[PDB]
Amino acid sequence: GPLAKIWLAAHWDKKLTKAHVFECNLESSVESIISPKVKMALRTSGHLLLGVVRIYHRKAKYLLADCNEAFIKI
Amino acid sequence: MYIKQVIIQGFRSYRDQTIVDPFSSKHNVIVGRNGSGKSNFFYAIQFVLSDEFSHLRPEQRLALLHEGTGPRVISAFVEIIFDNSDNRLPIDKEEVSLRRVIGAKKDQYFLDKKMVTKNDVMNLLESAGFSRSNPYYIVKQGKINQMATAPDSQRLKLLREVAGTRVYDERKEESISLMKETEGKREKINELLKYIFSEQKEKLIKRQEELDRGYKSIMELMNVLELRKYEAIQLTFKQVSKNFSEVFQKLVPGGKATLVMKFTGVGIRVSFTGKQGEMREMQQLSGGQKSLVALALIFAIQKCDPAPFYLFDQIDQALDAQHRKAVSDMIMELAVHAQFITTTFRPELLESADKFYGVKFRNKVSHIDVITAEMAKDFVE
Ligand SMILES: Nc1ncnc2c1ncn2[C@@H]1O[C@H](COP(=O)(O)OP(=O)(O)OP(O)(O)=S)[C@@H](O)[C@H]1O
Ligand SMILES: [Mg+2]
């Protein structure tokens, strides 16, 4: 599921490429952490939070790249 | 994820290369005399995996190096080969090899024959659900009877750590700082948007719009996590308590046990005689009874944060035959969902076991060899 990709971005951000970073919907990712499924201990929730912010961070950096190359091309 | 194979060399009594026959995914039991090499095997696994061995000063490193007459050793390594059928390890291999090499001036991990930091290793292990937090994957008799005799204050400290509040706080501080690191990049794209091939503008502004909704969702997430951080200790208490009572009733059929708060500490009240308001405080139980109850609590906590394998070094030492059989029956049940590697001197755990290993100390070194159920039972009696 999507919590799995979040789990990967928390601990092993290497095996995570642009394709997951762009495909990922943070709003639904976050929503599946907030709302049930199998209820999580606080420790796992903290990992998933760091994973969500990790992807948010990558999404922001990728947008920074496609900008600093489209403002240098036009 | 389970331990498929262990290779040891130069490590305490395992002076010479020691290639242990592949383990069962269920319950492996190891037998041998005092001084044969059983705890040394478990220390070899902990040397690779346990957070507490991750940093060592020279004085502790050389205590790991084999010492004795004959060939002097200068380096040691332990290698664990993980079976990765369930794909819990974020590496696309059926088998994952993790090796730690120790010398007086060297200390290096090799993940699948390639160098990795200590941080790589502990991140890898948490990826697969094997925390540097919950340190109950490995249990020792000294851990059990230390828990048998611990005060109520110790048990509350224990409960805090399984609640996870400390690491949650570290992840949040990590998250927030990384949030600040994006607010500067978000500023150098939103301010940078002034300039703007007409379609790519709308497609990029779509993605700016996406970072704006995600910022809001992240802020929402941080609120719900900060509110449950203050419910964690009470919620895990509730969870471990229920687990503890169910475990004890499986161990001691008509018995009853509960945890009680006080927040100052966590007490235990127990009745072996059968829910008859015969609730004794932990400290007034017998020696064996404290050790069974300590074990039930460990089993309850392992249930709050399960691991793919368990190492038990002499857990039934203080236990009589009735309570040993109960521990064995429980282990047989748990061993269908998790790997077990145990050592014992009594026959009850042997009934629970799918593979048997014998440890011998001969010619100044330890040896570990596959044996039969008959030989294990014969040794034990
Ligand atoms: N650095 C070392 N070099 C050589 N031998 C060691 C070293 N450290 C410990 N030993 C010895 O290795 C032998 C086996 O130790 P252990 O594995 O701890 O024994 P054991 O099978 O657990 O026996 P118990 O705990 O009495 S049932 C002991 O005699 C130790 O004194
Ligand atoms: Mg021992």
Domain ranges of chain A: 2-68
B68 Cβ inside 6 Å of ligand 1: yes
Asked if residues B136 and A21 have their Cβ atoms less than 8 Å apart, the reply is no
From A51, which residue of chain B is nearest by alpha-carbon distance?
Answer: B175
C-alpha angle B184/B186/B192, rounded to 5°?
100
Torsions phi, psi for B179 (to 5 deg): -65, -50
What count of residues does chain B have? 381
Cβ of B172 within 8 Å of Cβ of A56? The answer is no
Please answer whether residues A71 and B192 qualify as being in contact, where contact means their C-beta atoms are separated by less than 8 angstroms.
yes
One-letter identity of residue B364: K
Whether ligand 1 lies within 6 angstroms of the CB of B37 is answered as yes
Nearest to B367 by CA among B38, B49, B64: B38
Return the axis-axis angle of helices A42-68 and B199-251, rounded to nearest 10°.
Answer: 170
Q: What are the angstrom distances between the C-alpha of B290 and each of B68, B186, B348?
A: 39, 58, 20
Are B55 and B66 in contact by the 8 Å Cβ rule? The answer is no
Helices (H) and strands (E) in chain B, counts: 10, 15
C-alpha B297: how far from chain center: 15
Cα A33–chain centre separation: 12
Contact predicate B28/B338, CB 8 Å:
no
Q: Which residue has the tokens 């292990």?
A: B125
- Reduced to 3 states (helix: H, G, I; strand: E, B; else coil), residue B191 is helix
Query: What are the DSSP E strand ranges found in B251-364?
Result: 256-261, 266-271, 280-281, 309-313, 339-343, 355-362
Residues 6+ apart with CB under 8 A from A65: none
Q: How far apart are CA B241 and CA B296, in angstroms?
A: 11
User: What is the residue type of A34?
Assistant: I
How determined? X-ray
Strand-pairing partners, residue B116, are: B109
Closest CA to B122 of B111, B137, B106: B111
Which SS3 state, helix, strand or coil, does residue B350 take?
A: helix
Span between the terminal Cα atoms of chain B, in Å = 34
* Residues forming a β-bridge with B309: B339
Return the ∠ at Cα B113 (arms to B110 and B118), rounded to 5°: 15
Comparing CA positions, the residue from B333, B343, B351 lying closest to residue B312 is B343
Three-state DSSP at B286 gives coil
Terminal-to-terminal C-alpha distance of chain A = 40
Kindly state the tokens that stand for B28: 């492996």
Residue B25 in contact with residue B339, Cβ under 8 Å?
yes
Q: How far apart are CA A69 and CA B44, in angstroms?
A: 52
Starting at the edge strand found earlier in the chain, the sheet holding B280-281 runs B256-261, B266-271, B280-281
Q: Any chain A CB within 8 A of the CB of B175?
A: yes
d(CA B337, CA B307): 10
**SS3 per-residue string spanning A10-74:** HHCHHHCCHHHHHHCCHHHHHHHHHCCCCCCCHHHHHHHHHHHHHHHHHHHHHHHHHHHCCCCCC
Helix spans in B191-320 (H): 199-251, 287-302
A66 touches chain B (CB under 8 A): yes
Whole-angstrom distance, CA of residue B122 vs CA of residue B106: 19
Sheet containing B309-313, strands listed edge to edge, beginning at the edge strand earlier in sequence: B138-140, B309-313, B339-343, B27-31, B355-362, B365-371
- Residue B115 pairs in a beta bridge with B110
**Residue B214: which of A26, A41, A44 has the nearest Cβ?**
A26
Chain A residue with CA closest to B180: the answer is A57
Query: Is A57's CB within 8 Å of B188's CB?
Result: no
Torsions phi, psi of A62, nearest 5?
-60, -45
Question: Which residue in this structure is represented by tokens 């404290």?
Answer: B290
Secondary structure string (H, E, C) spanning B306-370: CCCEEEEECCCCCCCHHHHHHHHHHHHHHCCCCEEEEECCCCCCHHHCCEEEEEEEECCEEEEEE
> Which is nearest to B133 in space by CA: B27, B221, B236, B262?
B236
DSSP B21: P
Question: What residues of A are in contact with residue B232 (Cβ under 8 Å)?
Answer: 41-42
**Separation CA B202–CA A16 (nearest Å):** 26
Q: Are B356 and B375 spatial neighbours (Cβ–Cβ below 8 Å)?
A: yes
Distance between CA A49 and CA A18 in Å, rounded?
19
Which H/E stretch holds residue B39? helix B38-49
3-state class of B114 per DSSP? Answer: strand
For residues B192 and A68, the answer to whether their CB atoms sit within 8 Å is yes
Q: Nearest-CA neighbor of B280 among B250, B251, B255?
A: B255
Alpha-carbon span A51 to B57, nearest angstrom: 33
* Contact in structure between B73 and B61 (CB atoms under 8 Å): no
Contact B29, B380 (CB under 8 A): no
Please give the structure tokens belonging to residue A24.
């990922």
What's the CA gap between B201 and B196, in Å, rounded?
Answer: 6
Tokens of B379: 């040794």
- Find which of A43, A44, A61, A72 to mutate to test the B interface (most B CBs within 10 Å of its CB): A43
Residue B122's SS3 state is helix
B181 touches chain A (CB under 8 A): yes
